[model samples]
Target chain A: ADQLYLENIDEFVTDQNKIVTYKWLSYTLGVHVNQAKQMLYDYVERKRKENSGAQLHVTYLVSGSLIQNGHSCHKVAVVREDKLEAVKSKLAVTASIHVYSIQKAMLKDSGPLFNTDYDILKSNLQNCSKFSAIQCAAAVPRA
Target chain B: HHHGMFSEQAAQRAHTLLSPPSANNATFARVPVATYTNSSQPFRLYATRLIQMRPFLENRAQQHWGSGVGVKKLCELQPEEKCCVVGTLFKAMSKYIHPDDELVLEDELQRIKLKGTIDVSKLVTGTVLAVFGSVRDDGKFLVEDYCFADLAPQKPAPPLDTDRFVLLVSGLGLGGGGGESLLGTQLLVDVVTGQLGDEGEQCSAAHVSRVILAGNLLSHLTKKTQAASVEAVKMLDEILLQLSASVPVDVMPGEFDPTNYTLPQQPLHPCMFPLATAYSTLQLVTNPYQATIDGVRFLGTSGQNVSDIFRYSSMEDHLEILEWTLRVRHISPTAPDTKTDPFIFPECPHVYFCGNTPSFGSKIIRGPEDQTVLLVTVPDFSATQTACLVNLRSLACQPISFSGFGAE
Candidate 1:
């Protein structure tokens, strides 16, 4: 059960008024990125079901190979929830989607969203991607 | 039409996870060239090149023509006499064929027009060679033949018992397009990091000891917007952070990358990659990169040397010009002659590559003294989605490609 993580997300977004991105959560909580994504979705769902008039804006990441002008083109973008479909319609391939972040206020741009994750990544520069699904064998420096 | 329908369907797809083993990282010692902090006036720069190369030319002349033929300067040449002269080559630009295209040789003080026994179209300016012949009655020298300084002394690479690889990629063109190449670039990172492959493939990928990003990490934005450059560099910092964490990475600045716009461009500032710079695995190198990895000498530019030679010479193919540059040991022949002698190959590189080429091409050329050099032209990743791998043990290479299907 991720009840503790869900509660942590609630405090960060509702009480602390912080932008909780998947990357920041993964680095902070030392959890796998997939688990972090699920926690954000669960928190958003619970808040909406409670019907407390509290609104949360979410950003989604979409990526796939798009065929354009007879060449295969790979595309990835971070889009607002309302523009998710508009972004997906152009992928025309195996599209992978996931929650990128959740915030109390709608962002005019993704600058603040990047900044939120960049801070945590810069702080944990040595093991920034340690909890991600991908693993690099040669990442460790030779002693 | 309900957005809940999309979420409902997405929730049913199961997420799969796998744990893979990691390979121990490889290490190498970097060879550093002396920093050139002198004044860059054209007078001193050109003079330095001539002074440095004169002795090499004299040795080559003695080797080619025996002790009987002495090396003479342009001022020492006698009319209607057969003698060998050593000087720098100069070409006069013209619109069409050979009419207005005059070739001349310049020594310390004197200069003379050249005419016979030489392929003027093939020779580029700033080349130091030994031209054996005499002065003609028309004030022009008749070239009997010519010889370059040739390759410097090269020893065999250190013997390696096991198979280790160095992955070479360039021209990432980050932020160049509207995120068109991002996924492909991600796939490249995944394959290098041992995430996207099967158990056996992951083990094979683990043998990749190092990754060299030749140049052009970020695409050039012509809008003159400093904000856009900052944004692109920020994106590059994250990508580099991911790579350097997975393996040792060397990043070289390219023609369009954020750096000085001249040959011997300095390394990218560490402040640019705040995240990646924290790790010791990440190395920011110069435009013309040189290093020794696992005992193999590696040297090359970010493709400026090849591009400059291509523009000035009649040579059309990248491989031909690459070989010519090695034979002549002139990487920056047509350049603005830097304060230091950056062109000479004091220690011949086992792997000589030109990054950001139009396409991929490679060959193994042997020198007169049984020296073997592998020449490669790294293709732009944004266009081809391909990178190359060099095997250190055998001195062989092969290309790797990644692709995604439509609605597969």
Candidate 2:
């Protein structure tokens, strides 16, 4: 019979053992408990550095909703960091009587759009990949 | 986002996202939002490579002992040869040697037993350590002291900004041949595609920034034909392009997409949708993909991993599972490969998105420094054929179903 050497920590982790493992890692790794966590993250960081060139293709998502028919709207994107104004140029096709303006919001998992900053929304769309969504709107009349 | 003791000071720190506001937003500063990201080095990768290739663990020790000491190096040492060795902690698991030793030091070299009774009780078993002692005839490195490797702290999350609004849709099952599901899905497509020509609806459509479709773009469960596959492909292209015309659509690969049966299912190739080349809106991300939106870090998978994780947890609330994953720091802690991918170690994401959940659910899980993580479970759209409207800035989320359109 083989010794009960734990193969992986996850399946074995519970409140008691998790603290125990962290403490153990703390002692052996020569760090505090919270610092031990950072070290493990450091452990992950080591790998991240190694995999810097590892080709990972990640694209982001955003949600859009239309006011009259909230049920109808779907999310859209910039796809890449190209000129957002160029993308803004396409919204003109949808404009009938309305002058178009692209509005941007910074979405959270919960809460109001803290600093949604929709004023210069079009230009903000230029850089933010995490800038969750971009919507087409009729610009306010320049009166 | 919160401001208390650390929060106040943090608020005083340099902020993020400071351009100008758009008309709809009206007011608000360029204040910063917390961000989410993808880790190439999440625990999964770290677990496998426990032994880091630091130059001196061997080089310095060899000079100290006058003999090679890495795992494989000991075998070459002649009997009575003096050596100092260091490696990761492994119990004597090899069939050939069973030892009374509490820790076995194994390197990329091989397993080496320690002759000392050092107190590693404070140490985690998987951590890397270095010890030095003379080698005996049987290759047991006798009585010595050990030092744990002191690695640098984790790096801060690389941030990216996005809009605050997000749309989550799922189970398109666009494999063609009209049934109720297809009709419901098509209705959604028509509405979003602007084919319906509702001026009022268009007023609302111009607000969204991004979209998430929770896997199953086309169901593999359906009986397939070459033409149906083509139909599915064509329909997927048209629907996605239509929506992408409005915004970017990040699609998670499902059982139907071209991917293998594994956790962290790979994103589909760009070539899959040639039409997407023009708009580039149909961007395929990994199932249970992770990213940052408007400075908010987000992790979402197509609710498939929930049932997989359910085997270990007695908790029935699927929403609780999302919270559990966040607290535990892994996206799906029970996920195999089994070094669970934890997103919030050094830098926690403010938002966690779980797709294809039993129903839409949202909660705010408090974090350190008075911060918070918004946990959102996106419901399956095939059943609802509706979309979840999430405000990327506030993390406020709600569901909108086309009950009038008969989404049952």
Candidate 3:
């Protein structure tokens, strides 16, 4: 199963030169979003070990609690891998980091990321949160 | 599974997912008065007020008019009888071409035209008053005196030992202009997120326990058939996600935000904010939201009541109207709609605010029994780039403004 996702991601990234965001991959592969992030992480690590000289860029989602201005705040951000260190250094408390997307080329802004995920999310709005961590009971209606 | 690099880093980033601390672990409970019912009992809205105010007025009538003058309903009152009538006032308006402003008092079954030393112009329709006068030959109630039930006794606000603030703002007007106020909105986010402020200011920001967005999250654009544009909602979701991730946020639907166009407007659907809804801190509340935060009761609307009262009544100042509503023990006199006993405030709030006002105004009003109330008019963020902070400890309000350069 892991090999299947790795090969699939390789075809999309190395061959097709496409941006594989977690949401798009999650919906496409019918996997939990967090599992999709781990799959991307594994694929990137394997590719790096292979040393095939194929350039890849990844954006990561980082979040943590920080003590700033005298109170604790949870900071959440999606940033390129280059800025991950700076972001991590700023976190004072609990931190969580995961790969948000993997692409063949570096991106200029967050517009493409949101646009890609939005299209996939909207098409599957009914089951969008089915594989996510939380459920909104208020979203349901009664007869 | 080797669980090598990624797992190690995830653990190294503090062994836990990022869940921020709630401001002092403060608790919030909303009084669910802003609910709408499908039952066809519209008169119950007036009946609820009449019933609640009747006893108070009856007592006041006996004390003021003496025991001889008994309280009588409009239906039971005889012509040429001196008595007290406890009922709701109705102001009938006619065309500007004629002198047609008339006042009538109504009980459960009938109504009578009123005229006397009472100031009809200052009297708003829907107020339940104790009128001390007599029914005359012309069938008009010759009013000698009148009084509202006055402010209801307030539940004493629990005292706070430290200064904690709740930021109140409204009228974001997102997706209205061509990204004109976007910078200011971002500045507000940055300030609340503790990114753009200094240590002193950041400490103040840290003390801010909650952010109440009174209403009008989206701009009103007739060009869009849906009212709230999709892009506008997405933009608002992004901002709300950021704010919710940083601090607790309460978003109420105003006159514009893609909700049913009625008083006691329902909370915005969670489906509209897929990203922000993932966080428990993002609360979607009703327009006339009532909540108690850290033991301080807060009651306010997204300015629907104030705007309606301003248009129908002679009151111009938003703060004055806010205080007037508090004194009357009613929130939206001109709402023309209610359910679940909508407008009446059972317990006077420690802080009462009306949002999306033209300007910021505030006043501290005191009740007869050591009840101090803070009335605030939270200004529009898009127009004013301003928001006010209410100190829960002192019940004092302070306004904060954000400024940026844009086309004149």
TM-score of each: 0.69, 0.46, 0.64
lDDT of 2 by residue, B1-408 (tens): 221111111122221112111123211122222232344234222333333323434544454445545433545655555444555555432012223325666656567766755643322233345565566776677756554322222223334243345667776776543354553454354334332212333223333556778787777535558777877787576566545554556778775578755766777776666554345445677776766655556667777666544544445677886766554334543444343234323455666677667676767767433456677777767676566666654566655443111111
Taking the candidates in order, what DockQ does each have? Answer: 0.09, 0.02, 0.04
Q: How would you order the candidates by lDDT, starting with the best? A: 1, 3, 2
lDDT of candidate 3 vs native?
0.67
Candidate 3's C-alpha runs over 4 A off are: A1-143, B1-45, B62-69, B94-100, B221-228, B337-340, B406-408
List per-prediction Cα lDDT, in the order shown: 0.69, 0.45, 0.67
Q: Is candidate 1 or candidate 2 better by lDDT?
A: 1
lDDT of 3 by residue, A1-143 (tens): 45677889999998998789876887888875456666787888889779866699887766544554543343445667788888778877434566778999877665566566656755764454444432223322221
> What would the DockQ be for model 2?
0.02
Q: Give the docking tier of candidate 1.
A: incorrect
How close to the true structure is residue B343 of candidate 2, measured as C-alpha lDDT? 32
The CA lDDT at B263 in model 1 is 84
User: Higher-lDDT candidate among 1 and 3?
Assistant: 1
**How well does candidate 2 score on lDDT at residue B196?**
22
DockQ of predicted candidate 1: 0.09
